[PDB]
Amino acid sequence: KFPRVKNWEVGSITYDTLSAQAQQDGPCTPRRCLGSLVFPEQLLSQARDFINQYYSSIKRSGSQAHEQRLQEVEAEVAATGTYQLRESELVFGAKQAWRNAPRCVGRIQWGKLQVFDARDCRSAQEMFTYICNHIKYATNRGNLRSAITVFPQRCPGRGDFRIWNSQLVRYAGYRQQDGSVRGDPANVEITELCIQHGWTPGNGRFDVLPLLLQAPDEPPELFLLPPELVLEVPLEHPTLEWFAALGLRWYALPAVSNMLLEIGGLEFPAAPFSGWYMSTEIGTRNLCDPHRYNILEDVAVCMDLDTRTTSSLWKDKAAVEINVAVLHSYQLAKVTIVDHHAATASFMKHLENEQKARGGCPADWAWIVPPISGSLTPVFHQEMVNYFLSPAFRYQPDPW
Amino acid sequence: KFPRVKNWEVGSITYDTLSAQAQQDGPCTPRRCLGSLVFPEQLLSQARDFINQYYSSIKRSGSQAHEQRLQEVEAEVAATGTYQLRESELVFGAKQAWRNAPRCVGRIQWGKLQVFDARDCRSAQEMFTYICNHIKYATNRGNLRSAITVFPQRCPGRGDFRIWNSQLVRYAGYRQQDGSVRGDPANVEITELCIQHGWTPGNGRFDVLPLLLQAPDEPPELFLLPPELVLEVPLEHPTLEWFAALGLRWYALPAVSNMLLEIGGLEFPAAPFSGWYMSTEIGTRNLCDPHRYNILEDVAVCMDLDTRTTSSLWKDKAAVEINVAVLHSYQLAKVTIVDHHAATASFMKHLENEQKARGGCPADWAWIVPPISGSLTPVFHQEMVNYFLSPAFRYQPDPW
Numbered sequence A, B: 001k002f003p004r005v006k007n008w009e010v011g012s013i014t015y016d017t018l019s020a021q022a023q024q025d026g027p028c029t030p031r032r033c034l035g036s037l038v039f040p041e042q043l044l045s046q047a048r049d050f051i052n053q054y055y056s057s058i059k060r061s062g063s064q065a066h067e068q069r070l071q072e073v074e075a076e077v078a079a080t081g082t083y084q085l086r087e088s089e090l091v092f093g094a095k096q097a098w099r100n101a102p103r104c105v106g107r108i109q110w111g112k113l114q115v116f117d118a119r120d121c122r123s124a125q126e127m128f129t130y131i132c133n134h135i136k137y138a139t140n141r142g143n144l145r146s147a148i149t150v151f152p153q154r155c156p157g158r159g160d161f162r163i164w165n166s167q168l169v170r171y172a173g174y175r176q177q178d179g180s181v182r183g184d185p186a187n188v189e190i191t192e193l194c195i196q197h198g199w200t201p202g203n204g205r206f207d208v209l210p211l212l213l214q215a216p217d218e219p220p221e222l223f224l225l226p227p228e229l230v231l232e233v234p235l236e237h238p239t240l241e242w243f244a245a246l247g248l249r250w251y252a253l254p255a256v257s258n259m260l261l262e263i264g265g266l267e268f269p270a271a272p273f274s275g276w277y278m279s280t281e282i283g284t285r286n287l288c289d290p291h292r293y294n295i296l297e298d299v300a301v302c303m304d305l306d307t308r309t310t311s312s313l314w315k316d317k318a319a320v321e322i323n324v325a326v327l328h329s330y331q332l333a334k335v336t337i338v339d340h341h342a343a344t345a346s347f348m349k350h351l352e353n354e355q356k357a358r359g360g361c362p363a364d365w366a367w368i369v370p371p372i373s374g375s376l377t378p379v380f381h382q383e384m385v386n387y388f389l390s391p392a393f394r395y396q397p398d399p400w
């Protein structure tokens, strides 16, 4: 049967015919739903499917060129137990992987992704070079450009390339004596691993961490990111004069570097990607999450709000302002940034496009709906279907 | 094995063993997840499980009385195709149904539920008297008390007892010539059905609709709830003087009446229930949903906010204040009301209790997390498992 997807605001109805064609299986079963949980012959089966997707995307499916490519991949697998992608295929696969990310609300821009082929990378030093170049091209002095740099794939009889850091730009997390944490509590483990590997730690709340680059069958090397590459934005509020004084700030480039890029059976343990930040991710998750900076109560007290009772909605009021500050500070600094209203509205446009294009779109409601003002966005009143498609980006265990 | 549930704020882990006893299947499959979607041999099986549950609750499982009750239910079903519930079982079952509602965030009160057995009702006029006494009891002049009135179960040889209204108290929605709607847009269908059945409509924004009660195999009859029975609250803001002048208001008693009560294979098409309001439902959903009262833009303008650009976060700001107005207003009028922070905090408590009690708890993440400031609440960072347990409340097709 075809899942009926309804929008409860407008009453519109569509059918997801793309979900049937979904390969791998998820954690859900007819018995119980786990959708809220954060976490040889086979290879050939996936590769044949990917090649088909590619030739189908250039309207040449069933061609002699299509068959030649299919037979070529099989032969490679028989003689090596693996195979290699053509540039045009990688570029296509990278874009598809993003297009398929169920939790990403910025997919309307999936086709404009710039793919940098770094499969010829020889070492960590060269890896660091690729990363720096990526950061320069992506940051572009404020006018951000979405991009991904694909490093050499996972090959039999050797270790793979890996970026130990969860993101290319992260803030240190120094575990304090009294039990607290100076800086970002989410970066504690990686911060200590940087220290043990020979990094001289600071003592600020926003210290940019070094990159722990790992090459095949080799221990990770520390690499310091030149401050001139790491563009940052000082936070301030349009009417709250004292806000600037809080010394808060955040980086311009959101770059995930710990996810695995899977294309046609092939695995690329290292392939950092980046686009641009959605305000709420900085103002609501990063700055207000309890297990993170937790600056909510501090700002509320400074705003002179009644923090004694929950009924005053001081938390809600303080959060909104922190988010307004992020948006304000980024526009003033002329760094790309999009509020949750514009992001969700565009995603609704993406659904409509994907419905015409593929007859559906894998989406994860819990992730598409922003962490604040949920029902104020169109995506809240829009039913969604979550499923795994390939090519795709996947989570992977830490290299340590 | 059993599902591993995790809280990302604290880091705690648990295993939902209760899910493994799900008496029915859901919409999700390993291929895809549909969690965000809003919508004789079998009889004996469900009935027996229910009776087993009841005897386990009063620590008399396996006793003679237990074995006799089972033979009795089996005998009645063999002779009539159905069976009669003992008063004590009805009370127990009703509580389990609320206890099993995956979408209810106020289930910590499932134990304190008043049950009105009305299985001896014979007419629409008698159905009306029951409901009025229900309202008078639940409202309790402001200090609301949870309640549920159970009407005659579904019989094989006759129609069902139904309550056409989705709630015992709702505001009329009048379609205007200019395409607009005066009143609650969500109530247009039931509003027109009352008119079609002999009721002369009003012309206000908050007209309390008449009850459309239906007796077995008979056309529905109109019934007007005496004004003195419907406790309403005028909406005003603590500092925004102009808010009160908007003439906004909302009823005190939220009583779902269009759902079916399922107990031991027995169906109760009519069994209205009620508790008290969670501010967000009124302040965010009823008043701010684009397809509802849609007061947001007007409130923002009065707030002297800049609605020309989304980044100003005028939508979020106006929403927070509207929600503050609801809370302030109910407290002023001394009508029971709970904010999303106090509610979510009590739900986490309910989880801990259910873990020790039954070893788990069915929950729908999308419904538990409030429509605003989602991540500011504890339930957001709490993973959940959704499954169907019985006794339970289920959706059913409209009587017309």
Ligand code: HEM
Pocket: A097, A098, A101, A103, A104, A105, A106, A107, A109, A113, A146, A147, A148, A256, A259, A273, A274, A275, A276, A277, A278, A281, A338, A343, A367, A393
């Ligand atoms: C155009 C700018 C973009 C915006 C505004 C955007 C926004 C978001 C948001 C709000 C989330 C959910 C929260 C989170 O997971 O941290 C997310 C997740 C995700 N996005 Fe996008 N994104 C953008 C570009 C990209 C690009 C270029 C890719 C891939 C090539 C991508 C891949 C993903 C993936 C894989 C996730 C889930 C992994 C994770 O938890 O971090 N995004 N994005």
Ligand code: HEM
Pocket: B097, B098, B101, B103, B104, B105, B106, B107, B109, B113, B146, B147, B148, B256, B273, B274, B275, B276, B277, B278, B281, B338, B343, B367, B393
């Ligand atoms: C004590 C006060 C209560 C509060 C604060 C509360 C709050 C909520 C909220 C916020 C929802 C989600 C909104 C919605 O689905 O419309 C909900 C849903 C639900 N509640 Fe509760 N609730 C309360 C009492 C009750 C009682 C007394 C029962 C049953 C005896 C109950 C049964 C349900 C059910 C079945 C749902 C799903 C409703 C639906 O289908 O829309 N609730 N509740």
Ligand SMILES: O=[N+]([O-])c1cccc2c(Br)n[nH]c12
Pocket: A254, A255, A256, A273, A274, A275, A276, A277, A278, A281
């Ligand atoms: O903006 N965001 O919230 C966000 C979250 C997670 C990943 C990315 C990327 Br890549 N660009 N922006 C992101």
Ligand SMILES: O=[N+]([O-])c1cccc2c(Br)n[nH]c12
Pocket: A006, A007, A008, A380, A381, A382, A383, A384, B036, B037, B038, B366, B367
């Ligand atoms: O998923 N949805 O389409 C959807 C629409 C309207 C309300 C809700 C709630 Br509450 N959870 N999910 C919803």
Ligand SMILES: O=[N+]([O-])c1cccc2c(Br)n[nH]c12
Pocket: B254, B255, B256, B273, B274, B275, B276, B277, B278, B279, B281
């Ligand atoms: O308080 N609420 O938001 C709410 C929503 C939906 C149903 C009920 C009942 Br029954 N009591 N309170 C409710």
Ligand SMILES: O=[N+]([O-])c1cccc2c(Br)n[nH]c12
Pocket: A036, A037, A038, A366, A367, B006, B007, B008, B365, B380, B381, B382, B383, B384
């Ligand atoms: O923590 N959680 O259980 C959880 C469930 C569903 C979505 C999210 C997001 Br986005 N952050 N945390 C989540």
Ligand SMILES: [Zn+2]
Pocket: A028, A029, A032, A033, A034, A035, B028, B029, B032, B033, B034, B035
């Ligand atoms: Zn599911």
